[PDB]
């Protein structure tokens, strides 16, 4: 509950440091596995 509000408040922060901001934005998307890779490549 309070932890949830804390996490949300955190997500709305700049962190100034541009490396820090990019390192934050790259973690949004999860990784994949082999079958996901092959289906994705087939789509491409």
């Amino acid at each position: 509950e309070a932890l949830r509000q804390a996490r949300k408040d955190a997500e709305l922060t700049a962190s100034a440091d541009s490396v820090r901001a990019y390192l934050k934005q790259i973690g949004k998307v999860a990784l994949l596995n082999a079958e996901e890779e092959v289906e994705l490549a087939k789509r491409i």
Binding site: E11, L12, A14
Partner: protein, 148 residues
Amino acid sequence: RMGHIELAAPVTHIWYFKGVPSRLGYLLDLAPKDLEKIIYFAAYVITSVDEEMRHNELSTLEAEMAVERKAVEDQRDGELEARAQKLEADLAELEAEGAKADARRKVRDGGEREMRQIRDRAQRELDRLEDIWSTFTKLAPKQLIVDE
């Protein structure tokens, strides 16, 4: 003799942004934090809004949002009915077989807590739709949007 680099994308002169008072902010009436967020790609900003089409479609998209709210409420009540069925199964199991006096209430409270979480998810959906509708209804130029 001087040269010049043709920037692939525009940039803002730092002297008119960071130098307090932020002259860009005073001109545009954007708070220095908001200007720093927009300029350094930390928050979007609205630059144009068709007030006419906003006004006229404030009923059609209202109808669409009513349809979507009805659909989310229908899945909500279906989840509640599934809870009711599972709770009937749980109470049948508890009071039909020989179990502890509290174990039956333990599982029943567990199920009602699962439904409390389901209703919390329903509130999450209600927020996700209604906050967005409210954001549109007051959408005007020079408004900052965090949480992309």
